Nucleic acid binder design. Structure first.
Ligand SMILES: [Mn+2]
Ligand SMILES: [Mn+2]
Ligand SMILES: [Mn+2]
Length: 368
RNA sequence: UUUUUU
């Protein structure tokens, strides 16, 4: 329990970020399908002006949407896919990855965000120490799906995100896509089961992290034998700005998508702007490194976030990580303006697969 | 994917 708490206004004076580097990738689907070092679920961006001129309705198909994530019974916070891909990478070099924290981008994002307007309740994770490193996972085994009717704002907003993915992405590059396919994206059923994730090594301050992140597609082209961070794009839906209150909202979405992308080196953002009827009006591309300067013309928010990020990283890295500390377990939360760490005594969580599975523990021993 | 007063 030693450094049990970290105040949300704490800041490290160091803005130093590492160049993030792609280590690996993997494709998943509900029903436990995992494919290590496989890019099957990586999509390609294609949304021509001609398509946008057709007045794309991002609420279309909401009633017949197959919510495969909602229907699945699977552990959405699990590190299993990440660790498997990591194992395979370490197996190439026959050597543990050099890093302090192993986690999902989404969870780190939530950690940073809770100092800048993000909900404190979104931070609810486990930290387990093992082999000199910290393993961090969402505590929740399943996400919180909107349960209101499908004609509701809350449901349409939720769906539109996936609908815009279907209208703006392709399974393969344009050249390799049948015409029937290019011209009928409006008809096709929207899915959320299939995912593609990158696994990246990055850093802030003195500390290095390994982050899994879900990736929306390739913007321009893929390098089969190179690092594809620079080619990835993050897709996002936002309400068309026409009022002072819209603008402030959009500034938040910008800061937020900047959190989402800078963490793992994704430099391309595309935002589909909708009206209140969920009709797509236009699309605008942004470069991630540009967002902080854009926000400056509205704030020092990005620089502070980085200082916060370094503070919480060094704070978490103060947890004991020596040979006697294997399988210690902690709950990480946010409340009353601070982050909290609390050691746990739950032998079933610590000895089961929920955080670090046996096959991975066994793999790391085989290395010492 | 949705929300986040920041
Ligand atoms: Mn996808
Ligand atoms: Mn995504
Ligand atoms: Mn997206």
């Amino acid at each position: 329990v030693f450094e049990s708490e970290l105040l949300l206004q704490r800041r490290l004076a160091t803005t130093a970020l590492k160049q993030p580097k792609e280590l690996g990738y993997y494709s998943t689907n509900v029903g436990g399908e995992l494919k290590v070092m496989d890019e099957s679920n990586l999509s390609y961006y294609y949304l021509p002006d001609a398509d946008i001129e057709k007045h794309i309705d991002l609420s279309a198909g909401a009633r017949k949407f197959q919510d495969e994530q909602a229907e699945a019974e699977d552990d959405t916070g699990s590190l299993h896919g990440l660790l498997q891909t990591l194992m395979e990478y370490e197996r190439r070099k026959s050597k543990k990855v050099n890093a302090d924290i192993i986690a999902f981008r989404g969870q780190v994002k939530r950690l940073i965000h809770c100092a800048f307007g993000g909900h404190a309740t979104d931070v609810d994770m486990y930290v387990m120490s093992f082999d000199g490193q910290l393993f961090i996972r969402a505590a929740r085994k399943k996400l919180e799906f909107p349960t209101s009717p499908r004609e509701s704002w809350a449901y349409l907003a939720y769906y539109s995100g996936y609908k815009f993915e279907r209208m703006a992405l392709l399974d393969r590059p344009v050249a390799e896509t049948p015409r029937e396919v290019l011209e009928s994206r409006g008809k096709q059923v929207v899915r959320n089961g299939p995912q593609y994730k990158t696994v990246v090594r990055t850093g802030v301050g003195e500390h290095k992290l390994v982050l899994g992140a879900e990736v929306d597609g390739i913007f321009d082209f893929r390098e089969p034998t190179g690092d594809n961070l620079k080619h990835y794009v993050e897709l996002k839906v936002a309400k068309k700005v026409q009022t002072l209150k819209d603008a402030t909202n959009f500034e938040q979405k910008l800061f937020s998508v900047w959190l989402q992308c800078f963490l793992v080196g994704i430099n391309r953002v595309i935002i589909g702007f909708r009206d209140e009827k969920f009709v797509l009006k236009s699309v605008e591309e942004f470069s991630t490194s540009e967002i902080p300067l854009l926000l400056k013309s509205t704030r020092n928010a990005c620089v502070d976030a980085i200082k916060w990020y370094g503070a919480l990283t060094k704070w978490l890295c103060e947890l004991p990580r020596g040979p006697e500390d294997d399988f210690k377990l902690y709950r990480l939360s946010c409340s009353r303006g601070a982050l909290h760490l609390r050691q746990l005594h739950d032998e079933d969580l610590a000895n089961g697969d929920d955080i670090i599975p046996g096959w991975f523990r066994e793999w790391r021993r085989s290395l010492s």
